[PDB]
Design a protein around this ligand. Structure first.
Ligand SMILES: Cc1cc2nc3c(=O)[nH]c(=O)nc-3n(C[C@H](O)[C@H](O)[C@H](O)COP(=O)(O)OP(=O)(O)OC[C@H]3O[C@@H](n4cnc5c(N)ncnc54)[C@H](O)[C@@H]3O)c2cc1C
Ligand SMILES: *[C@@H]1O[C@H](CO)[C@@H](O[C@@H]2O[C@H](CO)[C@@H](O)[C@H](O)[C@H]2NC(C)=O)[C@H](O)[C@H]1NC(C)=O
Ligand SMILES: *[C@@H]1O[C@H](CO)[C@@H](O[C@@H]2O[C@H](CO)[C@@H](O)[C@H](O)[C@H]2NC(C)=O)[C@H](O)[C@H]1NC(C)=O
Ligand SMILES: *[C@@H]1O[C@H](CO)[C@@H](O)[C@H](O)[C@H]1NC(C)=O
Length: 585
């Protein structure tokens, strides 16, 4: 049901980590902004009604309560995305609606190392200060200020300190990421999930110039040559819109926030991507008939540069470790905790599941003289089939500096798949992983009664690693990034960049990408704060661009190398001549 009479200055596709802050910042500037979201209302502050029965009538949903964080693992359906082969949030708030909520003041090195000039640390520091003003951490999300079931934590944190590692409050010392441990920071506020759903979205829905369309999927963008006139929508659930939504004439811009796999899909379907992938959509049953003609295709490396943290699990067990079963907190919650979540917002349930114990980091100089960044996350839970009771799992992330990369491609079904596994292609990446375990072991060699299950004392760290299967299934961190890479090297000429420094899509005048897909690689940390920061930074850059000026007739409106305006002044049209030229006539 698309209304025959309306248009927007900005259309933002997808309501995730990138999209919600983008839509907020653009509407704050008084532009007409429409947020189009696949999924439904999630958290209570967005009008989400969904959740377990012990939550009735107290104005909370399954997405408000950090202790219910891990339900997505046993019950995801109608929530997780069905058009990808990996795990992603398809409700409002995207990933930030379903994840553990870990939230980090970024590490200045990450921006200096991963991004070209204009995105380095001195460039994005204002966006960092904005994002973290709206969402300061807490490493003690329970509103009374003290942390619960910390016995596991204290075992490890005293273990590490003894091993020569330094305690920090992570977000007070964002830049100290070598040989460091901290209480885990979260985006929570008032003991409720909070995040961008809690902050950016709330200021935006107070605005007249802001609109949200839920239960609505964007199929592709509607473009004449290099200029995007609108987006085409089919309902994902009844009550969603069918149609084609226009953007303000000439001026209008579209922002793709649909995610690392989401935005990539929309691009391919819009005739933007690699020749082979574009060819798959052309032969597709769903879009084949109505897809844009191949003369208007743009070749860019959409789907390449697929990146993720390489995850390696490890397990220990110790006597004073205390397990808590968060899965059992969905159905039959321990009643004092339920009582003491529902009234002052405290107790174990105001912490994310499972209990997420010490965060610790170190940086390893490799034989190639590349610095590789590690992050460990400890939790109280078994992992590798080790039992749940006294165990703690310590998961090692291989982050910034790792050189390997995979690929995302599309099926005839128009669902996305990871067809090149990104992990451990460079052996020096493996070397850092192994050395990190060795290092972890000697800091914990002095702890009384600590038992090493994974690896057990009968296997060497090296053997332990080489035996493992390298696949998303066992090794994914769910931190997928990079399919639409930001960079100065235009993809149409063979470069690696899908979008430019303004996040503008090469080959287009008005189309932009803000989400995890633009990152040249993964950062030190869980990315959500990074993606929010990037939303802050990109929206201000985009808002500093002057209004698009149309092309006078007889002028150039397009071509394979064209960087300029693709739209024609009133009284002439843009028509193709050859792949290097298009004129107004
Ligand atoms: C379960 C899990 C655990 C994780 N743990 C953490 C954590 O504790 N901390 C951390 O920093 N991050 C965590 N992450 C990483 C994180 O969730 C993502 O990195 C981040 O949310 C990605 O932001 P995004 O904007 O690129 O994607 P998304 O948040 O996934 O945004 C996608 C949004 O667009 C919508 N959408 C998709 N396609 C369309 C379409 N065609 N039309 C309209 N709308 C569409 C989706 O419904 C969704 O709302 C984890 C995520 C997973 C899933
Ligand atoms: C989007 O779809 C959802 C799910 O079907 C709709 O949410 C339901 O709304 C009814 C009444 O409006 C409630 O009784 C249900 O509890 C809701 N279900 C869920 C899962 O939230 C929602 O109304 C739809 N939104 C639009 C704009 O059409
Ligand atoms: C992180 O800190 C550790 C120790 O603080 C550094 O370890 C040193 O590594 C070099 C070789 O890379 C050795 O020659 C030194 O003797 C080590 N010192 C200690 C105390 O172990 C490590 O190099 C640091 N990493 C970075 C990237 O700064
Ligand atoms: C482009 O489209 C034309 C007509 O639809 C077709 O004949 C031609 O083979 C196509 N070329 C490619 C490379 O897809």
């Amino acid at each position: 049901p698309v209304p025959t009479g309306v248009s927007f200055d900005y259309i933002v596709v997808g309501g995730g980590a990138g999209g919600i802050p983008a839509a907020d910042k653009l509407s704050e500037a008084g532009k007409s902004v429409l947020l189009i979201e696949k999924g439904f209302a999630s958290t209570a502050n967005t009008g989400g009604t969904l959740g377990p029965e012990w939550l009735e009538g107290h104005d909370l949903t399954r997405f408000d309560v950090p202790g219910l964080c891990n339900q997505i693992w046993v019950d995801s359906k109608g929530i997780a995305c069905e058009d990808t082969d990996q795990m992603a949030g398809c409700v409002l708030g995207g990933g930030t609606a379903v994840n553990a909520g870990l939230w980090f003041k970024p590490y200045s090195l990450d921006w200096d190392y991963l991004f070209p000039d204009g995105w380095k640390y001195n460039d994005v520091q204002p966006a960092i200060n904005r994002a973290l003003s709206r969402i300061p951490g807490t490493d003690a999300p329970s509103t009374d200020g003290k942390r619960y079931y910390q016995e596991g934590f204290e075992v490890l944190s005293k273990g590490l300190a003894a091993g020569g590692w330094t305690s920090v409050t992570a977000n007070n010392a964002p830049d100290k990421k070598n040989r460091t441990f901290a209480h885990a920071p979260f985006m929570f506020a008032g003991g409720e999930r909070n995040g961008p759903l809690g902050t950016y979205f709330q200021t935006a829905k107070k605005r007249n110039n802001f609109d949200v369309w839920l239960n609505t999927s964007v199929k592709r963008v509607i473009r004449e040559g290099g200029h995007i006139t609108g987006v085409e929508v089919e309902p994902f659930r009844d009550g969603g819109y069918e149609g084609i939504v226009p953007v303000t004439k000439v001026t209008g811009r579209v922002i793709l926030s649909a995610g690392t796999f989401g935005s990539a899909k929309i691009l391919l379907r819009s005739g933007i991507g690699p020749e082979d992938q574009l060819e798959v959509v052309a032969a597709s049953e769903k879009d084949g008939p109505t897809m844009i003609g191949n003369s208007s295709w743009i070749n860019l490396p959409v789907g390449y540069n697929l990146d993720d943290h390489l995850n390696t699990d490890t397990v220990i067990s110790h006597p004073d470790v205390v397990f808590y079963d968060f899965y059992e907190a969905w159905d039959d919650p321990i009643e004092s905790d339920k009582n003491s979540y529902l009234e002052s917002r405290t107790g174990i349930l105001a912490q994310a599941a499972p209990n997420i114990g010490p965060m610790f980091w170190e940086e390893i100089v490799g034989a190639d003289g590349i610095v590789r960044q590690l992050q460990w996350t400890a939790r109280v839970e078994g992992s590798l089939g080790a039992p749940n009771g006294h165990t703690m799992t310590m998961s090692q992330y291989l982050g910034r500096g790792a050189t390997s990369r995979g690929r995302m491609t599309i099926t005839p079904s128009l669902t996305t798949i990871v067809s090149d596994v990104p992990y451990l292609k460079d052996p020096n990446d493996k070397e850092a992983v192994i050395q990190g375990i060795i290092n972890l072991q000697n800091a914990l060699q002095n702890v009384a009664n600590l038992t090493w299950l994974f690896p057990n004392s009968t296997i060497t760290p090296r053997e332990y690693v080489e035996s493992m299967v390298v696949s998303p299934s066992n090794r994914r961190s769910n931190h997928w990034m990079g399919t639409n890479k930001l960079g100065t090297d235009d993809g149409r000429k063979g470069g690696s960049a899908v979008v430019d420094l303004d996040t503008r899509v090469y080959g287009t005048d008005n189309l932009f990408v803000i989400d995890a897909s633009i990152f040249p690689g993964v950062p030190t940390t869980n990315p959500t704060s990074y993606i929010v920061v990037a939303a802050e930074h990109a929206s201000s850059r985009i808002l500093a661009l002057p209004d698009l000026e149309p092309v006078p007739k007889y002028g150039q409106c397009g071509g394979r190398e064209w960087t300029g305006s693709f739209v024609c002044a009133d009284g002439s049209t843009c028509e193709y001549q050859n792949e290097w030229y298009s004129q107004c006539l």
